[PDB]
Ligand binder design. Sequence first.
Ligand code: ATP
Ligand code: ATP
Ligand code: ATP
Ligand code: CL
Ligand code: NA
Ligand code: NA
Ligand code: NA
Lengths: 105, 100, 99
Amino acid sequence: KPANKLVIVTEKILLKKIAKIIDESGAKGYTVMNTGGKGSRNVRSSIEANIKFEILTETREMAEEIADRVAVKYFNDYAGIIYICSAEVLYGHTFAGPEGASAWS
Amino acid sequence: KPANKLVIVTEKILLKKIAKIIDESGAKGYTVMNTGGKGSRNVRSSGQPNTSDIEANIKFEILTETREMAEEIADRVAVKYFNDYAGIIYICSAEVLYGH
Amino acid sequence: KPANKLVIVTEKILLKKIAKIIDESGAKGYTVMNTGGKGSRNVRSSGQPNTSDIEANIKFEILTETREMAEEIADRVAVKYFNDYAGIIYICSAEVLYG
Ligand SMILES: Nc1ncnc2c1ncn2[C@@H]1O[C@H](COP(=O)(O)OP(=O)(O)OP(=O)(O)O)[C@@H](O)[C@H]1O
Ligand SMILES: Nc1ncnc2c1ncn2[C@@H]1O[C@H](COP(=O)(O)OP(=O)(O)OP(=O)(O)O)[C@@H](O)[C@H]1O
Ligand SMILES: Nc1ncnc2c1ncn2[C@@H]1O[C@H](COP(=O)(O)OP(=O)(O)OP(=O)(O)O)[C@@H](O)[C@H]1O
Ligand SMILES: [Cl-]
Ligand code: NA
Ligand code: NA
Ligand code: NA
């Protein structure tokens, strides 16, 4: 089943702030990694101080909503880039099926 | 050469268990990273990890010989472990330039 | 805008050397992670890493301007280092949204 994989590479200090935006979007979760890096926007600069989020979204609209909120709220003032990859989910939130009367477990 | 990039994000304590499945599948290698995260299945036995905890999880990336190999790995991980452990599995398309 | 995401997984000791290759290609930046791993080339001079060692390797992700730039980096790294050093290099398609 196709899904958008939204990636946000940004400053570590934004971790909780971005996790709240992701949650508010309706996305079921996110994965976050510590990283290093170098950029050319030269907002932060010309240890690892980055974080990388990967968020598998329900729709393209969901991914765009997260992206647009993060970028508008933070990217004039903080380093970061955002991009999307195409993914196909094999086992996701629905691993054990729906809840309620259509449940199979 | 086009390839399937299988991604398994799961509890860090499954590292050796998932490496065993990968090895047994015929896959030629894997890359693994520490991560944090949050999900909605709420099956981690110890609850959601701290937001600061960027080693609750591991992420495997496995460039597989075929699509069927990636699915074999996914299916065995999931049936063996995902009722008792947190985790998700997806695939991305990759073109291998060198290595592999 | 429709970009290439070039991925280089290789021995951590090559961090500075590959960063220089990336910078000389004209790439606007890169992201680098520690990783563990296993492969089948069996080139790494110190043998396979411990399953628990999640710092044997580095993984670079480079969003490039063109496919030509991605290829320049890849070819440079492999040709100069892959006889002697472990690693793999691949490309994923990415669409940059905020960039
Ligand atoms: N072309 C790219 N490929 C991969 N990662 C990138 C690229 N450009 C930027 N990054 C990642 O995004 C981070 C932020 O870069 P950005 O250009 O937004 O800000 P910057 O102030 O130049 O960053 P830095 O202080 O890291 O130099 C970088 O540290 C890096 O991890
Ligand atoms: N939509 C998603 N996008 C990206 N990563 C996700 C997503 N859903 C879950 N994950 C990753 O999978 C891991 C496990 O989530 P899952 O839903 O399987 O179990 P959980 O018990 O709810 O996990 P957690 O205790 O981490 O909240 C998460 O910690 C996260 O790294
Ligand atoms: N099929 C693959 N899928 C994902 N990552 C891989 C794959 N094959 C190799 N790698 C990554 O590339 C690294 C080096 O593997 P390579 O085959 O180049 O050399 P190696 O000497 O066999 O490496 P190692 O000592 O790690 O076994 C691995 O540690 C792993 O991170
Ligand atoms: Cl990663
Ligand atoms: Na910079
Ligand atoms: Na959860
Ligand atoms: Na090996």
